[model samples]
Target: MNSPIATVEVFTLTQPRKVPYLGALREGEVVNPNGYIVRKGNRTVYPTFDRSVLVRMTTEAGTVGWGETYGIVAPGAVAALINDLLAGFVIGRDASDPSAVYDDLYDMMRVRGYTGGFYVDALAALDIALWDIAGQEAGKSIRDLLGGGVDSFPAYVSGLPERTLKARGELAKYWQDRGFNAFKFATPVADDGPAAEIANLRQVLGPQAKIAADMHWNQTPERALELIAEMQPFDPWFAEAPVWTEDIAGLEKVSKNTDVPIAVGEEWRTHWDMRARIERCRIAIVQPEMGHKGITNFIRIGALAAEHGIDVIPHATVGAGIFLAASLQASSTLSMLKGHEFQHSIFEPNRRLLDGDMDCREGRYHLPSGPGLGVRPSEAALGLIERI
Candidate 1:
């Protein structure tokens, strides 16, 4: 390889970028227009800031690449873990050997029962940085490195949980008019019946648009089955996180009983998690979050899912420009890819972190050709970084 790995630098953003909204919340409150709320005890704790832990890997040949992890809820925790626990192992490593480094960290952490959470989250960020380095050094895009061609994939506009059916209907129509053929909604503040809102949306969008719902792990297996039955008439594209992650049997039950495809995996950190889901449940779509699993493991699960006849639809529901760009780069090459996720409102905040636009037309995004993710962080995006 032409790449000679040198030192690794880590930085934590002290001030979060101003982002107004995310997938499920608007103004930090739950307001479902359908008179039903998918309630979480900690729903009020949603992060308003676009905080992140940034990773920059520099090769001895002067090649540099950047990556980031989801840090809205715990950016500081992820930064500290990388600085204190993981940086020593990465600083002098070969950037071209991401799989070797990834395996070493995962096995070491596995010995301590560190299967998930901030530990894997930090490792994910570092692994992504190294891939960025590898791609940059080789003069290839991350997608090309992952065996995908330079082609654009379909994109979807994820809706915020709205307050009234009127508002929800209006939102769906707005996006429908914008050339989007598919849309997903966060469960409303008050859900009368998931089917009622779905039916209303179907009526407004004229049955041609693909609509999906995110239950956010709020239902029991039976409830999930029931919800699927109720909403089956509207023909939802998929039902995401209808049951909690640990409820494997429950998810299996719901998956087998209904035709609505069950989707999960944003909380998953490695291939093992994907393995269990595929073997234990009959899920049709696997949603891998790039910032949570990194490109190494994300690609691992994508290949694994393709082997099992499952589609890989990556999760990009939140994060800044780097996270979205990484998703766009990775999705370009995934053969089993169905589509990628994006919250329309995030584009403004995403722009603050990148040197240029991400090239979205109507609802589709074009692939970036620049090496190592094709997007550079602006100076303002790098300011106030507490380097470690």
Candidate 2:
């Protein structure tokens, strides 16, 4: 197959049903602004965003190189950009040259301030689609293309309820009872947060369970100090975003103050941003978001963390199977990679998009074997939503 050209055809598909937590909806919907909310009453609660984009480059010989894009509500806009601005640039070019094609599209956007959210997300979707096309054309799976290693990957349960100690304990027990050993709590131990609460949870959860917290940076360090001190008695797997992201010093301070490990990064935008934290703070795990950045850069960030002896626990926001699959592929290939930061709450739909079963055993996930992302989304699922 020739190097894949830049010609792009963008298609948008919707969810079979509404996803409550992350699905995009019209403004004025009442939301708690905290826990992932779904509209139940008067307002429509769009839950669990399930959507995808296909980027196709057709050759004169009838061969097609394809790629995919991911997003929330405004994915239509991204598709427009790809179809109009990006597609024509390499209409008849080679389909096998990903690096060259990636560079061209990247350079087109770089000067226009194209590294963060919208640009990266759009670019990442297209990039993954291209890899998919390339992989299919080559008759190889994405894992094989990237150098296969791990067939199974481990995931963390990111949606454990964090309202209170009792709520969290109950949530943990549910997963544990279900035979799940990995659980992520979206709660934080106070900076001065809670020794007793932590101890209580540790007692309830026991030492064997891997427990992590998001804290969501709801409190200041001084306030966190109170909670952290109280909670330190109970050991945790990791403490993530316990304080505001700007408070690295506070994070540094927290690392000094607690025995619990520090994990941060889901909100971090780039390797440069992460490198600063590694130099200054005591980060035990890196939580880079694959959704915000492309897999290539995300892997680079993981490598940077590994340099500091840290584990790369990629943060996946959207539940589109592509992100999870890509992150799983990265974790398997990267030398210093530890595991993934997973949210199976979105896994069902992601799984639905696949033609075959994507396996998860003992909290670990297995990478799919196919060209590109290794799995194609269910057309039946996409047929369920409105295109516009």
Candidate 3:
């Protein structure tokens, strides 16, 4: 049962996008040399296409596990960290204790102040792959091992990337007709302003649909309040990242000043990052991203949110459905999971890369029935991933 990890391989993959993320570029905006664009509206850098970093690990006994993380920008950075540093350290270790591996990797570089970014991101991908191996070795699904009993849960549609407000509203309506009842729109792409955007959505979706706004950290508390006031009439389900994550006081002010539930934590790498915000800000939701948190910290942060009576609606983004499966498996065990985010643009396009029952349909997510992650990469998926 104690098979040693025999090999760790890293790969990067990419897919084309019809329109840029958030929305089409604004006047004078263009793609930079690095294959990224600075969103003129929010000033955030986003890769022009959908992409992810993948990790594949195998034990001496030939058990294989897969993991993935955000490769939207500079995926090679994470690939390099894993290949040149983390992989060497992980090659000779136990293949069944992912949490122990996670801890060692974190401590290995903590002194260099590599607390976040590409370092932890690299660790997260490796950690997930290790867990996949562990679950296969144990002959149980990661969901069961995590102590969760549910086979499925509610999910929310996460972004409407259509270029205009009218198109975005119609997109939501289209999704609603397809059995998706709740959705969140990116404020940066709300060209007519969030209030008008919500108003359009409310009219098109009717009063029964639940709508949330992702402000994309573009507002100060002063401006956030004004925008929230405008959308409150239409009843926004929540206002996510209303202010920058680092501005705790400003975030608190926005939370206290309005009744709209404040949501944050999508980019957080560890439970400590989540802890500070939970203690200092009055947030109603914590969006621990599995691609960012891995299995160990995802469960840890979920528990922390649960103890504080906060809802845990994990975020899933631009990945090739590997970590998305991992996210759903871990989230199945989270008692306080109010909902999970589904990137319609990404998942619908990328689902062909996976072989499993894991799915989001009719406003709910069905967990993959697995002895491990319950899914494996399709041959096409492997063919698409480039060895870096």
| Cα-based TM-score, every candidate | 0.90, 0.80, 0.96
State the local distance difference test value for candidate 1: 0.76
Tens digits of per-residue lDDT, candidate 2, 228-326, equal 555555566777787877888887787677767878887665687787777887788887775555556666786787677887777766545655666
Q: Global lDDT of each model?
A: 0.76, 0.63, 0.86
Off by over 4 Å in 2: 16-70, 90-97, 161-168, 188-200, 246-259, 385-388
For candidate 3, what is the lDDT?
0.86
Weakest lDDT window of 10 consecutive positions for candidate 2: 17-26
TM value for model 3: 0.96
Q: Output the number of the lDDT-best candidate.
A: 3
Q: Cα lDDT for residue 160, model 1?
A: 47
> Model 3 off-target regions past 4 Å?
18-23
Tell me how far candidate 2 lies from the true structure as C-alpha RMSD in angstroms.
Answer: 5.2
Q: 1-388, model 1: which lDDT tens digit per residue?
A: 6466666677765444343334444344554542223325424354445566778877777787787887656566887777677877876787667889988888877977888888888888888788888778778877777765655878887854456787878987888888888888765433576888888888988878988888778788998888778888998989999888898888888888887888888889988998887887888888888888887888788789879889888887566567667777776667788988867776655666677457665778877777677776788777756675
What TM-score does model 1 achieve against the real structure?
0.90
Candidates ranked by TM-score, best first?
Answer: 3, 1, 2
Considering summed lDDT, which 10 consecutive residues are worst modelled in model 3?
A: 18-27
CA shift of 291, model 2, Å? 2.2
